[PDB]
Amino acid sequence: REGLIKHILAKREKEYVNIQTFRFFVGTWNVNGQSPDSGLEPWLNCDPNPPDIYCIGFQELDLSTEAFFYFESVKEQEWSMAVERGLHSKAKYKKVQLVRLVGMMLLIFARKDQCRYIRDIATETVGTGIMGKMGNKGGVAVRFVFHNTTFCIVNSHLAAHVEDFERRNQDYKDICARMSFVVPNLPQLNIMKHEVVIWLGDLNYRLGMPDANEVKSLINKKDLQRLLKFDQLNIQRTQKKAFVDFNEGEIKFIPTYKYDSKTDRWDSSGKCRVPAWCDRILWRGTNVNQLNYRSHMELKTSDHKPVSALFHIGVKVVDERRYRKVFEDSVRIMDRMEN
Ligand SMILES: [Mg+2]
C-alpha cells in the first residue's frame, strides 16, 4: 500500500499552507431557565463585518426536573432557532453542531462558504454537579478541525457561592481530566491536545470582598480595575491554581451578575447578592488576537447579562496550487526511486 505520499504530503505541510486570519464570535449566556423574551441581534449582530464561526454557549437553558433527569427539552429548540435568526445580516450561516447536558448547551454555527472545511467533529459532556456526577453543573464541549488547525470549544457552568472558589477549581480540573473525545475512526483526544481551546460560560467566580455597598458604588463610580484585583478568577490564575496557561481580555464592562429579571436593576432579593463577573471567555493557543470583550446590557431576558467576544484567529489554510506542485514533486521523486 504505497499511499505514503499521503503521509509525506502531511509532513510537507509548511510548503503549501498560509496562516489566514478568520473571525470567531463567541458568546455566553445564563438564561435562568427562561425562553427568549426578545431578539438576539444586539448580542450577535454587533460587529460591522460578519463572523466566520459563531460559538454560542448557554447555561441554565432548562431548570425543570425533566431536563435535570436527561429528558428532552422544548427549550433546546426554542433557543437554537432564536440564535439562527439573530446571526449577522451580511452572511448566510449553517448549523455545525449542538450539545446539551441538562441546561448547558453549546451551538456552533459556520458561514456557509466555510462549512465544507469543518471535519472530525466530536462532542463530550461532563456533569460535576450533585454527587460530582449530575448535570446540574459541569460542562459540555465540541471539537473539530477547521482547515488544518484543530479547535475545541468548552462551555461550562461551574459551582456557585462565593466561598466555593476551591470547588470551582475542582470542577475545572475534573472537566479537563474526564472529558475525552473519540474521533476520527483511534486515539482518544483530550481537551488540551487541541491547537486552539476556547473556554467560556458561567465560571461563577465572585469578587473576593463581602461588602456589597462598596462594590455597587465603585461600579457606579466607573472604577472597575480596583474591583478586578479582588475577582477570584483573576487571583486563581495569578496564583496558578486553575486556568493556566489561559488568557483573558482586559475587562471593561460592569459585572454581569446578578440582575432583577427584565431590568437593569441589581438584585433586590433578601439574599441581596454581591455583583460578580460570573460570565467569562478565556482562550489558549497561538495566532489568537482578541479585538473585543464586552457585555450586552440591553438584553433583559435573564438575571445574567450575555457576554460576547470577537476574535481574529489564524488558521492554516491549504493553497491548492502549492499543494499540487508539492504532491507532483513527491510522486515524481517516488517514481524516480526505481534503482
Ligand atoms: Mg437559576
Swiss-Prot record:
Assembly and binders: Interacts with APPL1, PHETA1 and PHETA2; APPL1-binding and PHETA1-binding are mutually exclusive. Interacts with clathrin heavy chain. Interacts with several Rab GTPases (in their GTP-bound forms), at least RAB1B, RAB5A, RAB6A, RAB8A, RAB31 and RAB35; these interactions may play a dual role in targeting OCRL to the specific membranes and stimulating the phosphatase activity. Interaction with RAB8A modulates OCRL recruitment to cilia. Interacts with INPP5F.
Protein name: Inositol polyphosphate 5-phosphatase OCRL
SS bond partners: none
Compartment(s) where it occurs, according to its Swiss-Prot or TrEMBL record: Cytoplasmic vesicle, Phagosome membrane; Early endosome membrane; Membrane, Clathrin-coated pit; Cell projection, Cilium, Photoreceptor outer segment
Sequence similarity: Belongs to the inositol 1,4,5-trisphosphate 5-phosphatase type II family.
Region of interest (5-phosphatase), residue spans: 19-339
Top-level lineage group: Eukaryota
Disease cited in the entry: Lowe oculocerebrorenal syndrome: X-linked multisystem disorder affecting eyes, nervous system, and kidney. It is characterized by hydrophthalmia, cataract, intellectual disability, vitamin D-resistant rickets, aminoaciduria, and reduced ammonia production by the kidney. Ocular abnormalities include cataract, glaucoma, microphthalmos, and decreased visual acuity. Developmental delay, hypotonia, behavior abnormalities, and areflexia are also present. Renal tubular involvement is characterized by impaired reabsorption of bicarbonate, amino acids, and phosphate.
Record-annotated membrane-spanning stretches: none
Function: Catalyzes the hydrolysis of the 5-position phosphate of phosphatidylinositol 4,5-bisphosphate (PtdIns(4,5)P2) and phosphatidylinositol-3,4,5-bisphosphate (PtdIns(3,4,5)P3), with the greatest catalytic activity towards PtdIns(4,5)P2. Able also to hydrolyze the 5-phosphate of inositol 1,4,5-trisphosphate and of inositol 1,3,4,5-tetrakisphosphate. Regulates traffic in the endosomal pathway by regulating the specific pool of phosphatidylinositol 4,5-bisphosphate that is associated with endosomes. Involved in primary cilia assembly.
Tissue: Brain, skeletal muscle, heart, kidney, lung, placenta and fibroblasts. Expressed in the retina and the retinal pigment epithelium.
Residue span relative to the full protein: 219 to 559 of 901
Effect of substituting residue 202 to A: Does not affect interaction with RAB8A
Record remark: domains: The ASH (ASPM-SPD2-Hydin) and RhoGAP (Rho GTPase activating) domains form a single folding module. The ASH domain has an immunoglobulin-like fold, the Rho-GAP domain lacks the catalytic arginine and is catalytically inactive. The ASH-RhoGAP module regulates the majority of the protein-protein interactions currently described. The ASH domain mediates association with membrane-targeting Rab GTPases. The Rho-GAP domain interacts with the endocytic adapter APPL1, which is then displaced by PHETA1 and PHETA2 as endosomes mature.
Organism: Homo sapiens
Effect of residue 139 to E: In OCRL; uncertain significance
